[PDB]
Every structure is written in C-alpha cells, then in structure tokens.
Ligand binder design. Structure first.
Ligand SMILES: C[C@H](O)[C@H](O)[C@H]1CNc2nc(N)[nH]c(=O)c2N1
Ligand SMILES: C[C@H](O)[C@H](O)[C@H]1CNc2nc(N)[nH]c(=O)c2N1
Ligand SMILES: CC[C@H](C)[C@H](N)C(=O)O
Ligand SMILES: CC[C@H](C)[C@H](N)C(=O)O
Ligand SMILES: [Fe+2]
Ligand SMILES: [Fe+2]
Lengths: 370, 370
C-alpha cells in the first residue's frame, strides 16, 4: 500500500521526535525535522509535505504554517499532514491522515454555512488513532492560529463508533420503548449522515447569538460554562431539525433523534470521578426537562413527552435571556448568572467548587460501566 | 448460606427503596423500612438489625444511628448494616457486609494510633460491591455524624485488586529495573499487609500538623488542595517507614515501596478527561521530584535516585512551611500559597481553572489504557 508506506515514514519520524515537544518551535530542531521530511522516500514526494517543509524552514521569521494550511483549506487533495501542539489532544505531534468527505444536504450547507468538514479517516498516523482525537482545529497546528474561514475537521467515523458502543446501549437500557424509532437498527451510513448534520449545526451555532465563540471563548471555558455553551448550540441544532421546513423531513427527524440521544444519554455520563463539561450541561438538561415537563421518569426509565419541542424552546429562550444582558452588564456578570442557572439543575459541591454526577446517571454509570 | 440469605433480603429491600432517597429521613418512610427489616426472616433477627430498627424507629426525636454505631464501634461482631447517604459513594443506600480483620503491628498501632479498621469484605450487599466504595466513614450513615473515636473502615481487598490491575502493569512499563524489588511477584497477603500500614498511617497523619482535618477540611476540598493533603499524609507515612526504627524492617520497607508506587504511578493516572484530586498531587510529586533530584527519567522510564529520602523530606518540609503560616495569616492566604506551589509543578489551565494530565502521564494513559 502506497499510503501505508507514507504513514510508516511519518510514524517513524513521530517516534524519533517524541521526547522533543519543548523544541517544536526551536529553529535548529525544525531545520532537522524539515530535512528528514524532505528526504523521506515516499512522504517527501507529497505536495503537502513540501508545503510543511517550507513552513518549517521559514518558521524563525514567519511563525505560521501558511503553506500547509493553504493546501488543506483549498482541498488540493484529501491529505492532512503537519506538526501539532494541542494540549487537549496530547497524542498529536507529527501526524498524517487521508480523509473522505461526506454528502451534505444543499439547504443545510447554504443556510447554516461554516467551514466544517465532517469526514471519515481512511488511514492515519498513530497520534490520530487515539480515541481522544475526534476533531482537528486550525489552532492545533504549532502556529496556534485560527481564522474564521479555516477548515475545521470532525472525524465522523469516531462519532459513529461512540454512538454504536455507548449511545445504543444507553437507549436500550434507559429509555422508554419506542423513544428513538428512527435510530433503532439504523445502519452506520444513516448515523453517519445524522452525525454530519450535528457537527455542521454545532459549528454554525457557536458563532451565533449574543456571546458567540471565539469572541467570548475565554468566558466559556470553566467546566459548567463550556458545557452550557455546547448545550446552547446543540439545542439550537435540535430545534433547527424540528423547525426548518426546507430540510428533508426524514433526514431532519433522524438528526434530531441523534442529537437529542447524544446529549440526553452519552454526554450525560462522561467523566470519572466527576462529570466533565459535557456531562454537567447534559445533567442540567435532564433536570430542567424533568422539572419543566419535557421528559418523565417512570421507574428509572425516561419518557420523551410530546411537549418536548416546546420545552426545548423554553430552555434555549432562557439561555438567550441570560446572554442578552451582555448588552447592559459585564461578561463576568453574565457568567455568574449562567452559573446560577446551571447550579439550580446540577449537583454542585460549593466547598469543592466542582460537580458530582447526579444520582440518576451515577447509577447508570455503575450499571452499564459507562 | 445463612449470610447469603441475609444479604439476599438486604438486596431485595435495597431494590424496593432505590427510588426513595429523598425520603430517607422521613419518619413515615423510616417506620415502614424498619418494619420490613424487622420482618425479614433472616436479616431481622441479627443483633445489628435490631439496632438499626430501633434507631430508625426513633429517628424523629433522635436523628442519630446510635445503637448501630455502638454495635459497630464495640465490634460486637463483624457485620455492618445501616442506611447510608454518602454523596461520594452514591451506590450506598440500605447495605450490609461482613468483614475480616487483618494482622496488626503493635508498634504501628500504638505510636500512630487512630480508630482505623483495615478489613477485607467477605460478603456484602450490592452497594458495597461498587469499585468506588473503598472505605466507610461514620458520617456516611444517614445521621451524617462523625466522632473522633468512631471506627473508620478501609476495604483492603479492593486496594489489593487495584494494585494488581493498575500498579503492577505500570511498574513494569514505567519504572527502571529494580525500583520496587519487594513488590515484584508479591502475593496478595504481602500487598494486603502493606496496604493496611498505608491506611493506618494515612488516617493518623491527616490529624497531625498545623492544618489538620477535619478541622480545616472545608479549606482542603478544592481539587488541588484535596490532593495535596492526601500527598502530605502519604509522604509523611513514606518517611515514617524509612525513619522509625521500632517498625519491623522488612514490613517497613515493603510499606514504603507500596505507598511510593501507588502515589508515583496508580494515583498519577486517575481521572478522565482531567486528573482527579489524587492525580493532580501525584503529578506535583512527579515534577517536584524530577526538578529537585529525587527521580530521573532515562528512556521514558523512572529511576529512583538514592537521594530520594532527602528530597521527600524537603518536599514535606516545604508543605509544612506553607501550612505553618496559618498561625500568622488566614486560611485563605494559606490556600493561595498551597495552590501557587501546586501550580508550579502541574499543568494548570487558568481560563478553565482546572488541570490537564501532564504529558508524561497522558502518554501512559494512552499506552496502557489506564
Ligand atoms: C464551549 C466549550 O468551550 C467547547 O469546548 C467549545 C470550545 N471551542 C470550540 N471551537 C470550535 N471551532 N468548535 C467547537 O465546537 C468548540 N467547542
Ligand atoms: C484531603 C482530601 O480532602 C481527602 O479526600 C480527605 C478527605 N476526608 C478524609 N477523612 C478521613 N477520616 N480520612 C481520609 O483519609 C480523608 N481524606
Ligand atoms: C459536541 C462537540 C464535541 C464533539 C463534544 N464536546 C466532544 O468532545 O465529543
Ligand atoms: C489514600 C486515600 C484514598 C484511598 C485515595 N484518595 C483513594 O481514593 O483511593
Ligand atoms: Fe463545541
Ligand atoms: Fe485521606
């Protein structure tokens, strides 16, 4: 396999530089790395490798990976190759992958446009094989730069895997019979499509509203607030799938079921021993929906009420009322009010200043090992 | 078994009351629970069950489980049975176990005395089978009360299990040849004796120093500070094993190796996606020892320096210098200085106000699945 030969070369260079992350911007190291990439029999031939070599060789004057990113962003081919430094994707150093794109609904791509690339990984170097690495953002490159039109990649094959391994099991164990009818027995190509809708809507809505990110990112990194912002955009996407009549009805209801099942179940159990940011927000959703009539618990089993669309709309309306006050108060004051809202519906420990898994999902974590 | 019949009856009542935690102090609920316990053909006739029934029936005027705790604290037999409400042990509701005590070193128990009970669980109800539940504290009972002479139980069999599942594989992969020779191939009884020394020294040293717990507990629940207090006491126990000549020399060195291996390795990888309280402090230890000459990294593997006992003494001295200022400054000022010390040697994200696994242990988590 030609691609296996290329990836073998990347993986061997990756091994050699594993102890040198502190030198990844040192020009002496970069010159040596660049020279080794250039001399790699198969890798060095590749246009994208020549671009990186040029970027690396010039880094002391221009600390940018402009040529590599121009290649990627223009989709000159379906390869990604660069030097990465992403603190939350620690497995990534010198990495390579080949991807395949997924079909997109024309109305979705036009009306909710963003530079998002839902793809399947065909082959990749070792750092990309970690289950941690589910996406790739422009600032993950060593230059740390992101522009609004840089392509952002989501590895949909990994979300399909997570849905099949975790979400399906949770639907069967936690939800009333018939809760997610379109998802039952749905094949991978179907979940793949719904997942691609989900990430497209996710990226689009992050940039909408009165406190979009990246503009207000540094106010939305505390665990509960990072989770709440995730939930704001995924509820927004849920409601688009319910309300936008220009989306194909069958595909939109599937995407709705998918986003709802992911946020109501899989994300709700994430994190050990404490909920991570996604789980805090998903437990907020669980308790809000329970309290406000969107779901019901009958003997430990979740029923989706027919009124759930109205309650999801009320929930998003409530978040938007809190954020709208950015126009008349400080971002710090809005933060405090977002936290107060979160804490009314989660298990916040004031002395630890952190959260506990609410008992409902703690028991599910125990029962299913999730 | 008669015991098997008792526990079956407990598990069945536990199932009946699973949805009712919000009523666990309601007298109408307690009157009914007490009656069902009293009528349990096997469980109801146990002396500890008579004690719980009396406590529960009297709870409206005496919100304490005094008769149950008197039975347990006086070790009238080796059964534990109560109604529990421990937010960090959410699996515990109505629970029952039988335990076996372990050999005890006379000097250790006299010089470092505490009401600690290192025991093995022989049989138990479902709540006690959770791997989360490694110990049982007096305030875990629904009355929420603790007294300085209440017995505190540690389930040593679970620490043996964790040692053999995580620590052993970590020693092999991460430690230089010959780092922990007394632990190599050690049988479960040997690990059990080391673990019982560890928990005894742990409980003892929590009450020593200038900021002991429980007195200063509410200042030591923030994740980094909770971990740093764990590490203060375990480094103290480490040094006791090295320095106290009236402890048996073979058992003392074994306990030293055990405690060091647990804090250097097993606790260092705890928590997903972020380190938990133990892991933050263990990564503080790792980086402190690296920079101050107590360990060295050669080929991704940790060598323990002969000078390590002196560097551990320096580390504990440093913690004790910060805590000593409680006598001239506020608890809050001490907290800030404990955090500043922690953050110098850990990966703190100031925008998230939380920690990331340091790269050394992130890589080990990926490689070994820990
Ligand atoms: C909101 C929360 O901080 C969450 O992790 C954000 C972070 N930054 C992001 N940036 C982009 N482009 N897309 C995303 O989905 C997110 N997720
Ligand atoms: C230090 C940190 O708070 C840790 O979780 C403390 C908490 N309270 C405790 N209380 C007792 N009796 N024994 C312990 O070991 C601890 N651990
Ligand atoms: C919804 C955005 C991403 C995919 C999600 N927070 C995750 O880490 O899986
Ligand atoms: C040594 C204290 C306890 C055992 C440790 N923090 C744990 O949760 O395993
Ligand atoms: Fe996001
Ligand atoms: Fe402790």
């Amino acid at each position: 396999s030609p691609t296996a030969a290329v990836i073998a070369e990347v993986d061997e260079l990756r091994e050699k530089i594993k102890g040198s992350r502190n030198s990844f911007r040192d020009q002496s190291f970069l010159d040596q790395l660049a020279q080794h990439i250039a001399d790699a029999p198969h890798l060095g031939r590749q246009p994208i490798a020549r671009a990186l070599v040029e970027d690396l060789r010039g880094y002391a004057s221009e600390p940018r990976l402009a040529a590599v990113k121009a290649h990627i962003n223009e989709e000159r081919d379906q390869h990604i190759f660069s030097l990465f430094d992403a603190s939350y994707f620690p497995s990534l150093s010198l990495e390579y992958l080949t991807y395949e794109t997924l079909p997109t609904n024309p109305h979705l791509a036009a009306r909710y446009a963003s530079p998002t690339m839902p793809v399947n990984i065909i082959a990749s170097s070792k750092g990309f094989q970690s289950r941690v690495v589910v996406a790739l953002f422009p600032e993950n490159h060593i230059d740390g730069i992101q522009r609004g039109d840089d392509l952002i990649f989501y590895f949909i094959n990994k979300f399909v895997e997570r849905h099949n391994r975790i979400t399906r099991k949770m639907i069967d164990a936690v939800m009333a019979e018939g809760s997610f009818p379109l998802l039952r027995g749905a094949d991978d190509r179907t979940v793949e499509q719904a997942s691609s809708w989900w990430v497209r809507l996710h990226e689009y809505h992050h940039r909408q509203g009165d406190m979009p990110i990246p503009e207000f990112l540094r106010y939305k990194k505390l665990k509960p607030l990072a989770g709440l912002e995730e939930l704001r955009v995924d509820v927004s996407g849920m409601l688009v799938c319910l309300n936008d009549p220009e989306l194909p009805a069958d595909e939109a209801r599937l995407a709705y079921e998918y986003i709802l099942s992911e946020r109501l179940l899989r994300y709700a159990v994430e994190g050990i021993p404490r909920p991570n940011y996604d789980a805090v927000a998903s437990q907020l959703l669980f308790n809000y929906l329970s309290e406000h009539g969107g779901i019901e618990l009958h003997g430990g089993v979740i029923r989706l009420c027919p009124e759930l669309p109205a309650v999801l709309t009320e929930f998003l309306d409530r978040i938007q009322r809190i954020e709208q006050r950015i126009h008349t108060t400080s971002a710090e004051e809005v933060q405090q009010n977002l936290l107060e809202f979160t804490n009314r519906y989660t298990d916040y420990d004031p002395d630890a200043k952190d959260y506990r898994h609410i008992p409902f999902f703690a028991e599910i974590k125990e029962r299913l090992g999730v």
